[PDB]
Point group: D2
Chain length 291, copies 4
C-alpha cells in the first residue's frame, strides 16, 4: 500500500554523495524509494540530472528530497533580501526537481535548519512571514508537480512548528493544495502527547512520514510505538511514502547537525548497515501496513 524508502545519509557523513551508488544499493535491498539531500542539486549540469533520473528509473526507484535550509535560504526571514534570495533558491531548485522527475520535497522548508538559538526569537513574526513566503513558493512547486512538505520538528531544532496541530494550523493558513504536513517519529516522540493522535490530527494533510527510533536507530528494535502508528495511518487512509532516516554514525556535518556524540552504530561496517536497513524495511512493511 505505502512506498518505503531510506535517506542516503544513513551511510554518509555529508549532505551530498554519489546518489547513483545508493540508488543501486537500495534497489537491491528492496526499497521503493531513495531520499536524497537537495543541497548538491543546484550544481548539477543537465546531463548529470538526466543520468541521476535515468538511474532511478532504470532501477525502479523513486527519488524524494529532503532539505535543511541555510540561514540565507530562510523563507521566514525578517530581512526582505534573504526572503528574495530564498524564493529564488527554491524556484531554481523546484525546476531542477522537475527535470529530475522528483515530486516531493520535505524538511524545515518554512524556516532553516539547524536553528541558531544564539539569536533572539520572534515566532509570531517569522510565522507570518513564513506563511506568506511558502504561499508563493507553493505556486512554483505546483507548476513543477512537486508537493512541498512541511516537517514538524522538535523544540531543539526549530521553534515555529513543534506538533502536528501547529503543522496543520500553519498548513491551513497557507491554504494551497500541494503544501502538506510531514511527521517524523523521532520528532513526534518528543513533542506529542499521543502518537496515533498526532497522525489522526494530521490526517488528510499528512504528505510524508519519516521514521526512526527514539534515538534514531533503524525502525523496529526501540521504543517507538510502530503498531500504533500503523493503525493510525490506516485510520487516516495514508497512501503515501514512509522514509526511514536512521542516523547512527558520528562524524562530519551530518554527525554534527544530527548530534550523534557516541557510536550508535556500534562499529557496523557498510555491509552490516545494509543488513539492518533491510531488516528494518521488512519490519516496516510488515508492521506498518494494512491496518
Amino acid at each position: 500500500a505505502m512506498k518505503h524508502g531510506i535517506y542516503y545519509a544513513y551511510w554518509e557523513q555529508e549532505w551530498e554523495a554519489d546518489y547513483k551508488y545508493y540508488i543501486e544499493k537500495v534497489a537491491k535491498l528492496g526499497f521503493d524509494i531513495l531520499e536524497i539531500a537537495a543541497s548538491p542539486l543546484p550544481f548539477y549540469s543537465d546531463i548529470q540530472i538526466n543520468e541521476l533520473k535515468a538511474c532511478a528509473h532504470g532501477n525502479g526507484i523513486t527519488l524524494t528530497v529532503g532539505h535543511g535550509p541555510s540561514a540565507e535560504q530562510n523563507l521566514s526571514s525578517p530581512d526582505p533580501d534573504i526572503r528574495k534570495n530564498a524564493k529564488a533558491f527554491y524556484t531554481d531548485l523546484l525546476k531542477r526537481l522537475y527535470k529530475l522527475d522528483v515530486h516531493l520535497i520535505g524538511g524545515a522548508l518554512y524556516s532553516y535548519w539547524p536553528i541558531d538559538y544564539t539569536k533572539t526569537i520572534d515566532k509570531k513574526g517569522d510565522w507570518e512571514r513564513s506563511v506568506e513566503s511558502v504561499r508563493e513558493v507553493a505556486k512554483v512547486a505546483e507548476a513543477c508537480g512537486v508537493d512541498f512538505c512541511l516537517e514538524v520538528l522538535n523544540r531543539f531544532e526549530n521553534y515555529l512548528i513543534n506538533t502536528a496541530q501547529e503543522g496543520v494550523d500553519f498548513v491551513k493558513q497557507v491554504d494551497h493544495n500541494n503544501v502538506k504536513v510531514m511527521l517524523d517519529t523521532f520528532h513526534m516522540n518528543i513533542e506529542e502527547d499521543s502518537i496515533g493522535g498526532a497522525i489522526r490530527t494530521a490526517g488528510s494533510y499528512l504528505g510524508h512520514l519519516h521514521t526512526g527510533e527514539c534515538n534514531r536507530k533503524v525502525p523496529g528494535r526501540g521504543r517507538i510505538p510502530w503498531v500504533e502508528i500503523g493503525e493510525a495511518l490506516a485510520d487516516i487512509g495514508y497512501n503515501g511514502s514512509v522514509v526511514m532516516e536512521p542516523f547512527v554514525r558520528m562524524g562530519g556535518t551530518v554527525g554534527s547537525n544530527i548530534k550523534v556524540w557516541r557510536d550508535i552504530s556500534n562499529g557496523a561496517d557498510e555491509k552490516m548497515l545494509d543488513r539492518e536497513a533491510q531488516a528494518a524495511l521488512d519490519f516496516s512493511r510488515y508492521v506498518l501496513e494494512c491496518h
Copy 2:
C-alpha cells in the same frame, strides 16, 4: 521514596522566593522542593538560615538543581575557567552545607545550555571534566553532599547522553559522593530501554527527575511509569524523585527549556497547583513497590 517538584514549574526565571514555594509545596503534599542554585551565592548568612528554618518548619526537604554558566564549566580547556569553576562549586557546596542540603544535580560536569556554535572536543572535555569533578567531589564529600551528574539528551549536552555513558563517567571519577542522575524526559530520547537504563545506573543512581515526553507533569503522557517504578524496585532505589514540569512560555526558563507554545494551556497558579498535586498522587501510587 520522597517526591518533590522543581520550583521553576511556577516561574520564568532561574530564581524566586523559595520560602513562598516551600509553603506551597508543603500544602500540596510534597516532601521536596527543588531550587535553582543561581541566587544562593548572593545570600547573606541570614538569608541562608531563614530558608533552612522555613524548610524544616514546613517539613520540606530541599534539593538543588543547577545549569552551570560557560564560566563555571569544569570541562573547559581554559585553566582560568576551570579554576573559577572549582571556586564556584566549593563556595556553593559550603553554603549548601549551611542549609543541610545533601544533594545537588544537573550538567555539573559541563555547562548548560551549551553553545553548539563553537567547536566541540568531546574526548578532551571529558578528560578535563572527570578530573575537575573528582576534585570538587572532595569538597562535596566534606559538605555532606551527593554531587549528581544528570544524563542529558544530545541537544542539551554532548558528553553524557545515555545512562551507560553516565555510569562510565562516574566510575572513572571513582569517588563516593559522585552519582549518576537520570531524567525521564532525556531518557525518553536517548535510551533503547527506560527500565534498562535505570537498571544500568543501578547503585550509582543518586537522583531522578520526572516529566512527560514533552515536559508536562507525570501522568497522562507516553512515559512508561510502571516500567520505571519496577526498575527502581529492581535496583532498590531509595533516593528522591523530583518532577520537573515546564509548561509555560516566556522568560529565561521558557527560553532555556524551549517552550514555544503554551503547553499549560492557559493554566493559572491554582490550576497549576492542582495538576501538580494530581501528578504527585499519581507518582507515589505508580512508582512505589
Copy 3:
C-alpha cells in the same frame, strides 16, 4: 464520567450487605457501587426501598452486574429454559426500576461460567440469543434500564469475544436499550487493539469494566490506561467506568474468577480500601 467499584472486590460470594459497601464506597469517594443481581429476587419491596434509600442517602448510584446460571440462559435450545430466563429478567428489570437502577451488565446473552463439556452450537445459540435479547429489551426500555452485553474472553464465553462481535450482536438485536459493554481484563486477551476495540464499540458502548491484566486494581499493571482515556474521549464516552478487581482466593468468587494464588498479598480490608481509593484517584486522573 462516573466511577464505581464492584462490591465483590471485598467479598467471596455473589451476595453481601450492599448497605455496608454503599457506605464504605461513599467515604472512599466513588460515585458508584455495582452489585450482583442474584440476591435481589429475594428482597421484599421493603428491602428494595431500604437499599434505594441507603444509596440516595450516601449519594451513591447503583449499577448491577449479573452472571446468569444455566437455568437463566436466554440462548438455550430448550424452549422452557428460555421461557424461565425471560421471566427472570422481566422480574429483575422490574425490581431494578424500583431501585432506580438504570444499568445492568454481564454475559446477559448467555450464561456464566460456561460449561465447556456441553458441546457448543455457536451459530444456534447466537440466533436464539439475538431473538431472546430483543424481547427482554422491550422490558428493559419500560423499566428504563440499559441492558449491557459484556464482551468476554474465550475461556468464559464463546458467543461474543471481541468488541466487533459485540457490535454485530447488538446491531442484529437492533434495539436502543441494548448496549455493548467492554472490560479491560477481557479486551487484554482478545483484542488486536485496545483503543481500536473501544473505537469500534463507539456509540454502542454502554458500560466499561476495568482491571489489570491479572485483575488487580487499575494502575500498576500493563493495561494501557492512557490509550483508553484517549479512545473514550474519541468516541465521546460519558457513561460510567466500574473497576472490578479480584485479588483474593477462596469461595465461589475465588473459584469462579480462578484466583489460585494470593494476588492481594495478604491485604486486609483497610489495605484493600486504600488501594481501591488510590486506583480511583488514578482512574479519575488518567482516564478523563
Copy 4:
C-alpha cells in the same frame, strides 16, 4: 537463538504428517518444528527413524509439546493414575531419545485441558506433582531430555500461573533437567511484568512459546516484543523460541484452544505460510 513453529498452526488435531511440516518449515526458513507428542507412542521403530531422518535431512530440529490427558496426570491423588502417568512419560522419553529430541514442554506437571468442575486441591496436587516430576526427571536426564514446565494462565491450569510460581516449583523439584517454560500468550494474562517474568525465570527458562495476545502470529499485536528481546538478552537466554499461533476454528485444537471466530480471516494454506514466515523474520529481527 533458534526459532520454530508448532505444526498445529496448520492443523485441527493433535497429530499430523510431521514429515510434511518438516519440509514446509525448512522451506519457510525455520530452525525448528515442534510437534504434538500424542501420536508418538504408537510409532513403530521404523516410523521413528523415518521422522528422525527427515528432520536431519532437512536441517530441522524437533521439539515436543504435550497436553497430558487425565490418565497421565502426575499430580493425581489416585496412585494408579500416577503410576500410569510415570510409565507413559518413561516410555515417551525413551522414544524422544530415539527420535533424537532434547526437549519436551507443556503442563507436564499436570494435565491439559483441565476439568474445573472437580473441586481443586492445589496444595495437595502441588506436593504430589513435585514428587512425581522429580522421579520422571531422572528418566529425562537419562534420555538427554529437558523436561520443561509451561506456566499457564488461570483458565487452563491452577498450579503454575506465574513465572515466580514456576521457578518455585522447579527449585523445589531440584533437578537439572527440569526447567521453567514461559509463553507470551499466558504471560500476557498473569504477569505484572513481561520482562520481569523472564528475568525472574532467568537461568531456569529452558523454552519459550510466542503468540500475540489473541494467539495470532507474532508481530502486529500488543505483545511487547522488544521488551522480551531485551529481557532474553538480560538473562542470556540460550534456548529456542517457538511460535505457536492458533487462528483456525474446528477439531480438537479449535475447541481445546477455544478459537470461536475465524481469526485467520479465511487464510488458505499459502497465506498461512506467508504470515508464518513474515513473523519468523519479525521474530529474528526484534528478539535479536
